[PDB]
Structures are given as C-alpha cells and as structure tokens.
C-alpha cells in the first residue's frame, strides 16, 4: 500500500489509497507490459479463523466468492468544518491502517499538535489477537517505563519489523495549507503557491 | 473556497513535483490525483500499481464521494482454491505466485474518477509517469530493502527478478516495456487493460503461470461509486472508506467509543501507558467484531447500521476496562446475545 493526499486551490481535495498488497504484490510481472500484479486474495479469509499476512481473520462474510471484494483496512479519509476542508490523510500499513489513522486524528484534534508532531509521533496497535499483543515500530519502539508498565498489565510487545505506516496529510486553516510526510518514509509535501 | 494555493503530500518526490506541476498549470485535485497515481505505478512499484487496486475519497465542489477499485476475485475462483489435501491453508500461494491475484481495478478506478471531475485532457495525464518510466527515477533505500524482503519471499518462484533485478538503491531504473503501456493507456484509457493490447498480454501471464483470470474477468471489472462512511465529532465531520473497507466501521467506533470514555482520557498524556492500554481496549472490540461481520456489503447483509449505532457505540465503550487488560476469551462480537 502507499497513500497520497491533494488539495487544489478551489478547496477540492482528494485522498488516495491503493495497492499490490505485499510490497511488489504476487510477484508476476506480465511479460511483455511490465508491471506487476496483485496479491489481494490473501485478503479474503482462506480458511475461517486463520489468521492471514496482517494476522487478521474472518469467516463467512469475507469468504472467497467469485466477483467479491476482498475487506480491506484502507482508509482513504478527508476531514472538514463548515462544508471546507479541514484535513486530509491517509496511510498504508495492512490492519494497522485505521489504528494509525486514529492515532493522528486523536494528536491533531485532542492533544492539539502541529501537523507535523502528530503525525512523527510514536504509533503502536493492538487487533484482539494475537492475544495481548502490541505492535511498535523500530522507527519509535516501545521502550523504558511505558513498555514495563505495559508488560507488568500483561502486554507482550512485538516489533512487528516494518514502520507503523506512512501518513501523508494535508491540514487547511482558513485560506493557508500545511503539508506533513512520515518520517517514516521517504514522502515530500509541498504547497503550491 | 479560495485557498492560498494547492497542496500534495505523496510517498515520494516524484508523485510530489508531478502532482504539483498538474496544480501549478490549473488542474484539479483529481486531474493532479491522476497523474500522481499514474507516476507512482512507475516509481513506487512496490505499492503504487496498474496491476492492483484501491479507494479514492473525494470532497469535491463541497460534496463527499467514494470511489471503489479494490480487486475482485476471479471468477474461477472457490472457497477452498488455497487449502491443500488437509484442508490446511498452503503456504504462499495466496500471496505468491499468479493464483494470488484478484483482478486489479486501477486503471479503471484513475479513469472513472477523472471521466466525472477532471479537468485536463487524460492522455497529458499519463505524459509524466510516461517519461518516469522511459528516462528512469533513482531507487530509494527503503524501496531496495522491501525489494529484498519481496526477493526472499518469492525464492524463485515467479519472473520478479528479471524486471525489477537491475532495481539498485541510488541508481536509475528504467522501465521501458511499462512505458509502452502506458502509452497504449494514454491513447485508448481501459480499453487498452481490460479489452485490448495490454488485456491480451494479462492473459497470456495467466495461461504461462497457471492464474485463473480470464478475459472475462477483465471485461466484467467495474469500479463503483459509493456513499462514504461519515463520522460527526466535535462539529467536524470525516469522511472515510465504507465496506468493502473495515476501517470506516473501524474508525466509526474508535472515535465513538474514545468519546464516550472521555472521563477516562482527561489528562491521560499521549503514549502514556494508560494511554496506550485504552486504545488497547477499545481496539478489542473493533477487532472482533471485523472478523465475524465485515465482507463485501453486495455478498451479505452486513449490519452496518446495528454497528454504528449510537447506542450500540455506548454498549461497546462500556466494556472498556480502564484499569487492566480485559479478558480476550470474554471479548466477543458485538451483536451477539
Ligand atoms: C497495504 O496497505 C496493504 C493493504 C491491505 N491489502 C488492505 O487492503 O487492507
């Protein structure tokens, strides 16, 4: 997955999500095209309660069907105020997607950071199971006093070996525009003026 | 509403200057959108695609819309198509391999998209992503290690390395047979990918690696508008994915249920221990119930509205346990008596 957000002068806005799933997909290349296809099946539950590649399960209702799409956790998302604009963003990262959304909607619109605060801090993400287990990133590991008091409740902290996402976003106040890429990634913003 | 110029945030510097460029000279979000994404499927090949699929959230003209290109299974394809003699899933191959692939909504997706908003002609559109693949970008450091990871995964089991082997961090890589498409893109939209030069190219993969899409599967793909999920807080209001993503749903109770615990948040500091273990519990229900409810919403009659209901988000928040981690045995799907 990669995500990227835009703004036009005009107040229009779009958020784009998409994807090939694992990084370069199934690995097929169409010969003679050039580009690689898709591994999304592995989104549909293969077998009920097994967990896939994102270590999320299903049954019935996200069974393989002919002509059926596959849940995803992409979140292609546009914030506003008044009928305007107000934030755009979006991430990719499988099923921690919404959490890291989440995340940098609770940082800009509870605890009130710049942009660029919110969206640089430390992420992390539960999903019921694994049982107790919270996920970090290697870019802001858990470490120190919140990882021990997290492991005296019963944590089991992983480092799940790839960023917690890569949020691109585009903040609007009043007429000015702000950009903010993950420094987790190697995103550029840029406001065109 | 008249801003003070436009803005992209994009995952590298090329969809970044490409989409600013389509701004600069007076294109829209969604003609700039076109481009960008056209330009990644050259430059973030890990991820931005022809081949795959995806969601567009748009507010345009002050109107929310959602538009759906996620794949879709082939028509071949079964329930039990990855288990084995075991009836035990086989390792990999649904994510390696041609019978990993559902049919990619792409380019259909960019074309629907910029047929209802845009602005700019199509084919000038493509020009940049064009000479991206032509001239070549410079391969990123994160981009070679997932290339590595995607390497390890693969061992030999499919023609990944005899495109993107030369793809080497610092150094330029071109793409020329991609250009071609590209072009045949410009000039003739889907009609090229799913019924013409590009489709023929598709199939033949498919008939040499044992994947099951078809022509049929190619001519049959449409993307969909939907509405999108929107969630009132605070006066804002979000718009975001609705099924066939979970994440709407997701967020919906998120920051439903956070709201309903606002006691238990005041004065909590942000990755505080506390802070983390509330997200934690409220994660817990989220999670369960996208496992039992959440599909394809033309497939079954998902409960979206039961899940997103007011009350319903109250019941949840009421199972958050401040105070230590609830029992995960005891953490059941929502609607279940
Ligand atoms: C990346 O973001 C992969 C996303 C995953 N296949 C999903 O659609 O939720």
């Known amino acids: ?193 | 509403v008249t801003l003070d110029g436009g803005a992209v945030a994009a995952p590298d510097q090329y969809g970044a200057k490409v989409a600013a460029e389509i701004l600069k000279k007076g294109g829209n979000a969604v003609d700039a959108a076109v481009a960008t994404a056209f330009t990644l499927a050259v430059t973030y090949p890990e991820a931005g695609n022809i081949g795959g699929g995806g969601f567009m959230t748009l507010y345009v003209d002050g109107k929310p819309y959602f538009l759906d290109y996620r794949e879709i299974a082939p028509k071949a394809a079964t329930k039990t198509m990855y288990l084995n003699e075991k009836g035990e899933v086989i390792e990999n191959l649904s994510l390696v391999g041609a019978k990993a692939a559902g049919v990619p909504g792409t380019v259909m997706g960019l074309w629907e998209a910029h047929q209802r908003f845009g602005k700019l002609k199509w084919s000038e559109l493509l020009t940049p992503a064009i000479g991206y693949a032509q001239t070549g970008f410079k391969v990123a450091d994160q981009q070679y290690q997932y290339r590595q990871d995607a390497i390890a995964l693969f061992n030999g089991k499919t023609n990944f390395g005899d495109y993107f082997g030369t793809m080497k961090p610092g150094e330029v890589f071109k793409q020329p047979e991609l250009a071609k498409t590209l072009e045949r893109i410009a000039d003739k939209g889907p009609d090229d990918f799913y019924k013409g030069e590009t489709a023929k190219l598709l199939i033949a993969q498919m008939k040499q690696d044992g994947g099951l899409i078809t022509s049929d599967d190619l001519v049959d793909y449409q993307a969909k508008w939907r509405e999108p999920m929107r969630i009132d807080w605070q006066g804002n209001t979000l718009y975001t994915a609705p099924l066939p993503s979970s994440g709407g749903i997701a967020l919906a109770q998120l920051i439903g249920i956070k709201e309903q615990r606002a006691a238990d948040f005041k004065g909590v500091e942000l990755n505080s221990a506390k802070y983390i273990h509330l997200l934690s519990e409220i994660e817990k229900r989220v999670f369960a119930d996208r496992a039992d409810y959440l599909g394809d919403p033309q497939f079954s009659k998902v409960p979206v509205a039961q899940l997103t209901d007011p009350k319903y988000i109250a019941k949840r928040a009421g199972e958050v346990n401040p105070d230590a981690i609830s029992a995960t045995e005891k953490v059941r799907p929502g609607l279940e008596p």
């Open chain 1, 1 to 193: 997955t990669t995500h990227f957000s835009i703004v036009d002068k005009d107040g229009n806005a779009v958020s784009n999500t998409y994807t090939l799933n694992w990084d370069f997909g199934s690995g097929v290349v169409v010969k003679g095209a050039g580009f690689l296809l898709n591994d999304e099946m592995d989104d549909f539950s293969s077998k009920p309660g097994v967990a896939n590649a994102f270590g999320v399960v299903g049954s019935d209702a996200n069974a393989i069907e002919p002509g059926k799409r596959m849940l995803s956790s992409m979140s292609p998302s546009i914030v506003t105020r008044d009928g305007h604009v107000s934030l755009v963003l979006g991430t990719p990262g499988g099923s921690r997607i919404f959490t890291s959304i989440f995340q940098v909607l609770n940082n800009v619109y509870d605890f009130h950071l710049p942009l660029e605060k919110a969206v640089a801090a430390q992420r992390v993400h539960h999903q019921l199971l694994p049982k107790d287990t919270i996920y970090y990133d290697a870019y802001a590991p858990l470490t120190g006093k919140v990882a021990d008091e997290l492991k005296a409740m019963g944590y089991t902290l992983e480092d799940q070996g790839w960023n917690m996402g890569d949020i691109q976003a585009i903040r609007v106040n009043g007429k000015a525009l702000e950009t903010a890429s993950d420094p987790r990634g190697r995103g550029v913003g840029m406001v065109v003026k």
